[PDB]
Design a protein around this ligand. Structure first.
Ligand SMILES: [Ca+2]
Length: 157
C-alpha cells in the first residue's frame, strides 16, 4: 500500500505489469496513444466481446469480503461508432462456479479516454481465483487501457 494508497499502479511506461490477455486476444505496449506518459496497453485479436485484458488479484492483499478502489482509463480509435467499456471481477464462488461481477461500465465514442472507476467495490466473501478485467459489451474492437490502479477503499483518483 504505497504513499497514495495504491496496491498496484500500471502506467505501462515500459512494462505490462501483471496484465495478460483474457481469451484468445493479445495484449502489448503501444505508443500510438496514451493517457499519461507515452504508452498504454493495447488489446487486440479479440474474437468475442468477452475477450480483453485481465490481471490476477492476490487474495492476501485483496481480501474477499473487503472493500477496495479500482480505476482504469480506456479508449478506442476505430472499429465502431461507440462502445461500452466494462471493468469487471471474474472469480470462482463457493460452489466452484465461475462468476462475473461488474465493477464499473461506461459508454464512449472514438478517440476519447473514459474513466472506469469505483472507489467502493466490495469483493464477494466467497471469491477465489480472482481477476480484475476490462472488456466491452458487444464488439471486438481493438482498445487501449492506461493508468490501471487497485487501491484502498475511498481512494480518490
Ligand atoms: Ca501510460
Amino acid at each position: 500500500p504505497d504513499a497514495n494508497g495504491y496496491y498496484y499502479h500500471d502506467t505501462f511506461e515500459g512494462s505490462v505489469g501483471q496484465w495478460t490477455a483474457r481469451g484468445p486476444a493479445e495484449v502489448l505496449l503501444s505508443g500510438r496513444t496514451a493517457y499519461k506518459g507515452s504508452e498504454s496497453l493495447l488489446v487486440r485479436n479479440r474474437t468475442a466481446a468477452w475477450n480483453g485484458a485481465q490481471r490476477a488479484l492476490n487474495p492476501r492483499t485483496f481480501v474477499p469480503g473487503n472493500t477496495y478502489c479500482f480505476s482504469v482509463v480506456a479508449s478506442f480509435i476505430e472499429g465502431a461508432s461507440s462502445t461500452t467499456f466494462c471493468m469487471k471481477l471474474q472469480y470462482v464462488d463457493g460452489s466452484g462456479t465461475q462468476r462475473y461481477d461488474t465493477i464499473d461500465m461506461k459508454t464512449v465514442g472514438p478517440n476519447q479516454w473514459v474513466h472506469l472507476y469505483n472507489p467502493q467495490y466490495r469483493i464477494p466473501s466467497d471469491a477465489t481465483d480472482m481477476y480484475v478485467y476490462v472488456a466491452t459489451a458487444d464488439d471486438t474492437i481493438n482498445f487501449y487501457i492506461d493508468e490501471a490502479i487497485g487501491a484502498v477503499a475511498g481512494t480518490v483518483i
